[PDB]
Amino acid sequence: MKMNVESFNLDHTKVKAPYVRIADRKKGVNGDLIVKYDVRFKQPNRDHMDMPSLHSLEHLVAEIIRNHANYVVDWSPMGCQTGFYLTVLNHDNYTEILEVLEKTMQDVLKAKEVPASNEKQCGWAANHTLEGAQNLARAFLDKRAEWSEVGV
């Protein structure tokens, strides 16, 4: 059957994390294209990101990717804690997305702090960690070569 939600149609047991998958392409009535990418850090049901590191990598990448790209719509963590969804508008070169992510992960490692990590600009300012975030980004980076190998 075809599920209502795109990711419910992905066989999680066959993908090989880490990877960047074209999860969805929507073209608006006016022709504008919206593309969604499943950037998986951990292997489904085999591992996951602890919330403090996940939460910080969200602030860091959300803020930084937008320095390297003018077409980012959103960067949101998955509830399953194994990855993030990246949404872009009017951009459709898979390779350029990997380079943008690459440049972005590199700047995460050179970070000296986690952006807007206080009670004025965050709903849980306490739950943060730059080290964990950076640990996640380095690990993701170390397998850059495998990014386009989704596995299924």
Interacting stretch for Zn ion, rule CB under 5 A, among 42-50, 77-85, 94-102, 133-141?
A: 77-85
Binding flags for ligand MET, 34-73, as an x/- string (CB under 6 A) = ------------------------xx--x-----------
Q: Dihedral sign, CA of 123, 125, 130, 135?
A: negative
Report DSSP state, residue 6: G
Distance CA 95, CA 85 (A): 17
Q: Is 80 annotated as a binding residue?
A: no
Asked if 13 touches a copy of itself (CB under 8 A), the answer is yes
- Rounded to the nearest whole angstrom, what is the least distance from the CB of residue 60 to Zn ion in the complex? 11
- Rounded to the nearest whole angstrom, what is the least distance from the CB of residue 145 to ligand MET in the complex? 27
Binding positions for ligand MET, 78-97, rule CB under 6 A = 79, 85
Instruction: Concatenate the DSSP letters of all residues of 9-71 into one string.
Output: GS-TTT--SSEEEEEEEEE-TTS-EEEEEEEE-S-TTT----HHHHHHHHHHHHHHHHHH-S-
Please measure the distance between the N-terminal and C-terminal CA atoms of the chain and give it in whole angstroms: 18
13 binds, among a copy of itself, Zn ion, ligand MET, none (CB under 5 to 8 A by kind): a copy of itself
Kindly tell me which residue out of 122, 135, 141, 148 binds Zn ion, with binding defined by CB under 5 A. 122
Annotated binding-site positions for Fe cation? 55, 59, 122
